[model samples]
Target: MNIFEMLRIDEGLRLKIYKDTEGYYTIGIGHTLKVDGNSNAAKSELDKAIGRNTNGVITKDEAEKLFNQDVDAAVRGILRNAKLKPVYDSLDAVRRAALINMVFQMGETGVAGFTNSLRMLQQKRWDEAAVNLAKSRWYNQTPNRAKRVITTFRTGTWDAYKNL
Candidate 1:
């Protein structure tokens, strides 16, 4: 299966809007409606769907479709960024997917802040890239996830990444 399918399986098909473990309003397979000023049409649609009722819901198939659309858009955003595209294109599927995942977790602009890591990737210095990734505050916040992505960067294999 592809990354999207794998993510769907891991996140489960939550058709109804509910508060996630982190207390964010979430729906459609873990899509969070945080409205942090970087709002998009999809986020707006989600917000409208859930509305003030809070007891709102959607179908599982609809949720899956939304999830797929969201992931595709995010992937496109990462691939289209001039600074990140060259480094993204140089990576193998596993590494590319790892970068895509990072872009999703942190916005494209946020991921762009990892200039040293991107430099390491552009230079094809896998070990150094992994080290730079580990040094980020993101890594400090999510060590297990960081380890998996760092391993993918260092080893260029998705074998050890559980969610992938």
Candidate 2:
């Protein structure tokens, strides 16, 4: 199922899925342990998690709003550094979007802080990038998401996004 269907949300209210700093989805001023953010990546992640394609596309505005809502200023400052250029420039479109998704969910420091994955990706090490990408706490914690992104990075394809 798509993220919106999974969360039972409609396009008009999709922005409500934005998470707080503590990794909780806020619904009516209360937090819940749930998946949040625009469905751009979640649809792909969910598809991998459930072994099927999802149906939806998170619009560009929804994506920006979610990012702005979740990521604080301190984190953006660090991510804006030139050090990220290598990782940013090295990735293909799908992989870049995947990286943005990870960074958005995990904070810049938390995501770019991944030394091995950043190093491997910067060096154009596809296998190493896949391995390193899968070695994070996010990876171990969320196997399906790791699988989806790592698979994208490895194959340089986004077949999972066809439905979107």
Candidate 3:
């Protein structure tokens, strides 16, 4: 089976829209309906699409399909919008995957907001990138995860956050 299938199985299928562990409206295998930051617009749009305050159901197969589409779109977005594309392309698989995960966690636009970190990454200044990453709100919000990402940036090795 494909990695997408494995992720679908790992994330589990949920037919009904419900809050995720982080209390955001989520559905169909951890598909976040809310975007972080001060953006209620995306959340409202997703809520409307899913019929907020209403019961909506989708098949597990459908969820898997959506997951594939979403992941593909996210990767395309990262490739298209990340100014550090060359840097990203040059990284090892683990480091590349960490950046992809960051892009997934924060939308491409949100990831782009990390100006200092992106600049450091584009310049191939791994130490600066690690420092910038550690100083960001993303790090403050998710310290352990951010530390792992920073470590990957600095070392290009998959040690911590292996499951990610």
Candidate 4:
């Protein structure tokens, strides 16, 4: 799988709305709109996303649209971040996808906290970057996902992405 497909797998697609681990209403590949969960605007937004009254249901196409939009935002976000842009550009496509996945999972500032890791990445010191990333709380918080990402940094390939 490519970045988008891999993310869809990582995020886990759902056609029915459900409360996430955080108790937020989430659907369609972990998507939760920015509006307050109980707010009318939230419903309105989901309705718009579904192209009609949502009734807690999301079509696959609608889910895909939400996922694509999110990926684009992550892409643009990485490009615009003063700290990440140059290093992000210096990376290969596979490595760039890993960064985008990082931004998508934790948002820009969260990934930015990996300061030493990012510096190692910029220098193409793969093992140093992987070690730094492996030392973070993120490694413990979501071990499975973070393992794949850190291994990708070390190996510079999709080998770790298999069978996940």
Q: Which candidate number maximizes TM-score?
A: 4
Model 1, residue pairs in steric clash? none
Cα lDDT tens digits, model 3, 102-126, are 7766778888788777777777788
Residue 112, model 4, lDDT? 78
Report the number of backbone clashes for model 1: 0
Put the candidates in TM-score order, highest first.
4, 1, 3, 2
Q: Estimate each model's TM-score.
A: 0.79, 0.56, 0.68, 0.87
* Candidate scoring better on lDDT of 1 and 2: 1
Candidate number with the higher TM-score (3 or 4): 4
Q: Give candidate 4's total backbone clashes.
A: 0
* Pairwise TM-score winner, candidates 1 and 2: 1
| Candidate 3, residue 45: how far the Cα is off, in Å | 7.5
In candidate 4, stretches whose alpha carbon ends up further than 4 angstroms from where it belongs are: 35-45, 48-51
Off by over 4 Å in 2: 1-23, 27-79
**Alpha-carbon lDDT, every model:** 0.72, 0.54, 0.67, 0.83
In model 3, residue pairs whose N, Cα or C atoms come closer than 3 Å (at least 3 residues apart or on different chains), thus clashing, are none
Q: Which segments of candidate 1 are over 4 A away from where they belong? A: 9-13, 21-23, 36-54, 162-164
lDDT of 1 by residue, 1-164 (tens): 35674455435567665665555667777677764433344356575754533344677776777787778877898878988888888988878877877777667898888998899988889998888788778888678767766787788876654555
